[PDB]
Design a protein around this ligand. Sequence first.
Ligand SMILES: Cn1c(NC(=O)Nc2ccccc2Cl)nc2ccccc21
Ligand SMILES: Cn1c(NC(=O)Nc2ccccc2Cl)nc2ccccc21
Lengths: 242, 230, 243, 229
Amino acid sequence: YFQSMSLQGKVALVTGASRGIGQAIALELGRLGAVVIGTATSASGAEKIAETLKANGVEGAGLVLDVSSDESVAATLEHIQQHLGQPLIVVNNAGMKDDEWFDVVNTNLNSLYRLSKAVLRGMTKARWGRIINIGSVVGAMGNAGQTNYAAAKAGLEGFTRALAREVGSRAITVNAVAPGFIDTDMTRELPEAQREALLGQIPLGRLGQAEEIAKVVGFLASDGAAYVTGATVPVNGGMYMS
Amino acid sequence: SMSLQGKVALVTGASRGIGQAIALELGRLGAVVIGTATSASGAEKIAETLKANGVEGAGLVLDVSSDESVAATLEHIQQHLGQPLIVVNNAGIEWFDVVNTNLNSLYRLSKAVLRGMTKARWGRIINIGSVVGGQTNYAAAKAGLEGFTRALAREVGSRAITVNAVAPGFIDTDMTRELPEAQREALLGQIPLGRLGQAEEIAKVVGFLASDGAAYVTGATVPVNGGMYM
Amino acid sequence: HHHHHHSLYFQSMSLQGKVALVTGASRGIGQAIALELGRLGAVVIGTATSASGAEKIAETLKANGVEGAGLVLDVSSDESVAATLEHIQQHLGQPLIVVNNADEWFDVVNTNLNSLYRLSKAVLRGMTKARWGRIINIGSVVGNAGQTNYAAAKAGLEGFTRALAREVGSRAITVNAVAPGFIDTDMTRELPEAQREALLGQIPLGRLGQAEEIAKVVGFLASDGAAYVTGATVPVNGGMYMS
Amino acid sequence: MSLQGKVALVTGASRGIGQAIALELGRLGAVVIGTATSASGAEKIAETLKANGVEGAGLVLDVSSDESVAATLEHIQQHLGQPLIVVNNAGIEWFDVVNTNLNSLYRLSKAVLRGMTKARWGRIINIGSVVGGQTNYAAAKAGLEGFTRALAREVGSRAITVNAVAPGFIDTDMTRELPEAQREALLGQIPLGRLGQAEEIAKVVGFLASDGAAYVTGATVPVNGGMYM
Ligand SMILES: Cn1c(NC(=O)Nc2ccccc2Cl)nc2ccccc21
Ligand SMILES: Cn1c(NC(=O)Nc2ccccc2Cl)nc2ccccc21
């Protein structure tokens, strides 16, 4: 089963998989042959994920996972090990004024670290892995919205790069995807005058689709992206704010 | 489903190494591939490689430093095969003159192929950086490529043409295979993956960027360096 | 029992009447920064985590005719920060110039940024009241292990500095960082000649920086002339850039 | 410290940022040669320098021309001495602008390196374009940063530093006449909530020219009140 874009035989964990980008990522990795475990912080979210996966003929499961909790992480990983196997593809997607940036970024990076560490033992044993971190979508127009956005992206890029360096010798790659303005929950806070002003800052002149983030994640998870590590790939239709 | 069926790709510097690998990968994804070299023997060899791997296309002689060569070659392609909507600049070549010259070559060729991409309201331009194997030339060439790529992407985005770059680290190629062992070992010590990349691993990235799924990626430079950043 | 609080017109003196707080001021770069701000006319409070450090600071300041004090401060502690700042307010005034110079890859960076944030937030009330301030963050000096940690710490410092600058700018408080390369201290002088020469070959200037050369940059950033510089990280590395 | 005993060359010195840089280096004790592309500009520069008690001169220089550069440098060498502080502020779609400017920086920088090499000391400082669209601005900045960094690496062994200053929205002739809608929109994107003054660029240039900035090389210092594009 030696084929290039295919994830047949691999177990992927996708946190925050119940809507938007997380959902699109879960279906895309499913489409590529992975067994997909999607998580949410509630039972209704976990149920919704399972429904979505069956409806699209993807083998896997919805679980409840709280990335902020050492216990939740340990317990969830164990459950996955007993019933489905070791997740070797892990996609972290779980995660207004200009003074909110610090706690938000700080909290997220502690969660990335917590989860990443837990899954490394299995990736280390298999001498293979993919960790892919999804940045926050640009999430409020104006200046407070830019601050939080640039801050979260700076931290994600630096974190991703450092972790990639730590774990590379084990043939585990660690990358990030940095979305711009995507068509999702944030995008549907949307007066048309401010919308058009927004599309004028994006060279492609449109919002990205959640699928378009999911495609990038899918490539990074593949064997072909094995020499890509420590990278943050921007998926923002040419609109760069930092 | 990641497919380039019906598309004509132009890949400069396609007779060896990374250029070759890119030509085959785009061929593998269904594109009709036109690979170039600066000599006729190179152009012929490219044709032979494409057939040997069951890829439709052609080898042409192209000099990216020459306005005449560029114009003539593009016209040739338009008459016989169609408009190239995927273009991969891999041909390149004192730090100042090297970078300055390369970017003029990127600009020259990019400008020429934009008319056809503009007409089709679709395109992919992908610029391949120089491989590592001195540090000054490398960082300079990368800084220019990144900035160039980002600016061009902004200029042409309204037309649904994306422009991206791929920045290789230490890749296994004809130029690197016989570097002295001291320099090779020093470079492996700076690479977390602890190995050299293959030309195919660059080609896979280029292939994804040429696909429909990378339509919201533009102005990016994707480093492909096994975690070694310089 | 050890004590934790130890308290002709030069043309350089442009920070006249300003109180500067310099954490980690007992040796090296922190010391050099304390003297340089002293030389520019500021009243300087240098800190260390021990009483002997705090005493050494006071002795250095007096020996160079700089008014100020050595205090004991633990930037990791909310209590220490609150207490120290109160003490400074009662006895010397509001510090309007603040220079932060005080699995490992993650905890180091994470811890430091929480310390920066803790201290920065505490001093902002006084800067806000005065409608003027300078916060300057000193990165770690360079030193597989030592490049990863270095680039990580620098990426965090840059992003942190830039965000904080955006948050506080409306109040005419600037927030900048200085990112040292290979600086000449006790530890780099005592390297074997072969490794030292290999290091100097990676630095275009072909030498190690002096602590004073970091201090000069910090001094300019603290001045009125750097009032439109904010959110910047100034590299001071003799041309040697590690990403 | 000061620049007593040093000859500084400042291209584009007749108005705005270039003028402010000329006066600031003058104030710090340098002998200042300011250039412009016209004779009236050159005259104006001389008048400004005398009015502020700065020793020096106004010359006509075209940085795009090998002949103009060679001739001007020779003239400076005969009459005033070797310029060891050089500030490139003269500049000028996106591709040709940036390409042209960097060739100008390279042309001029190369010409002044012989004298800096002979003295074993030098300062080259490149001033970026003031914001005024975002594409041209980011492109020009990316090139300036990369150029500055490469040149710094080439010449560092000689104790010559090479740095750049990247202005954000500065108060100048070109920005005074901007409509008060675009103005207010720009102030809202600048944390300091104001435009920079030309003097504030000049102060940074002055520090970089000093002995205290001797370990700073290859840097681009942004002077944009916190507004980063
Ligand atoms: C809290 N925080 C952090 N936290 C953090 O742990 N960063 C970090 C840790 C390891 C490696 C790189 C980074 Cl950036 N980074 C920030 C960047 C910008 C603003 C806030 C940040
Ligand atoms: C010659 N050159 C150039 N030239 C140049 O035109 N760069 C450029 C062109 C178009 C858009 C952006 C850039 Cl940076 N950029 C350099 C960056 C580093 C070193 C040399 C460079």
